[PDB]
């Protein structure tokens, strides 16, 4: 429908304090009842495309651009210096901590050439996706963010230091570099499942060009910090791949 140009992106990213080494940028191509939900598709070569679904809050071809900016900045918040190096602390602080740029895992094998513990989720906030988790979880809890004694709970002490410093670094950035007039308090919620415990640290920040920016990081701690199920080599054989066709053989 329209075509944003990338200087309209870095015109918003320029207002990110500390952003000195941004990601490779191109032009996003916009292409946008059913619960009143609005779906916007962004095509860009590369990586060719992507998509977003959100509530309409009458939409127009002038505010959907505000939305896609509100998430572009949200992702680029992982390369602003003081939080990227704080990540690098959490990946380099363990031999078997593998990173993707969006999630981190452990052990496993490529074979060809992971197990989420820390998912960096830009453009999300637990408040908007809560109700789907309170029903699925047994109950909720509190996670004191400025105290580590629970960071030893979720992750072993080999990573509690850099994990705590990372999430509290995000807290400092959102509270000091994108603060609203009336400051927004961070929202940290814990949910206990039968196989894992998931915690979400959610932050809201003020940007001049868009209505708001938000960021959440999820950290899941399973019921075992035995754990020799990770030593079975059948997991070195696992791959991923299913065409469907009406076939009758009887």
């Amino acid at each position: 429908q329209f075509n944003i140009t990338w200087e309209e992106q870095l015109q918003a990213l320029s207002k990110l304090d500390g952003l000195h080494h941004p990601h490779k940028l191109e032009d996003i191509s916009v292409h946008w009842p059913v619960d009143i939900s609005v779906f916007v598709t962004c095509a860009t070569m590369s990586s060719h495309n992507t998509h977003y679904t959100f509530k309409p809050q009458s939409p127009d071809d002038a505010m959907v651009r505000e939305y896609v900016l509100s998430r572009i900045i949200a992702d680029n918040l992982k390369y602003v210096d003081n939080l990227y190096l704080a990540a690098g602390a959490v990946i380099c602080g363990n031999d078997e901590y593998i990173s993707d740029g969006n999630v981190v895992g452990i052990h496993i094998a490529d074979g060809v050439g992971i197990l989420p513990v820390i998912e960096f989720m830009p453009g999300v906030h637990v408040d908007d996706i809560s109700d789907k988790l309170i029903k699925s979880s047994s109950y909720q809890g509190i996670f004191k963010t400025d105290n580590l004694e629970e960071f030893e709970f979720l992750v072993d002490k080999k990573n509690a230091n850099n994990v705590k410093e990372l999430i509290l670094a995000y807290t400092d950035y959102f509270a000091n570099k994108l603060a609203f007039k009336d400051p927004a308090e961070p929202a940290v919620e814990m949910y206990q499942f039968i196989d894992r415990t998931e915690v979400y640290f959610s932050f809201e920040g003020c940007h001049p060009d868009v209505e708001e920016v938000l960021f959440t990081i999820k950290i899941v701690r399973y019921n075992q910090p035995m754990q020799v199920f990770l030593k079975n080599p059948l997991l070195s054989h696992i791959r991923t791949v299913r065409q469907d066709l009406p076939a009758k053989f009887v």
Binding site: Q57, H125, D127, F180, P183, A184, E185, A187, E204, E211
Partner: peptide
């Protein structure tokens, strides 16, 4: 606004 204001306390 412009829909925001989640946890302003």
């Amino acid at each position: 606004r412009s829909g925001q204001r989640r946890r302003s306390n």
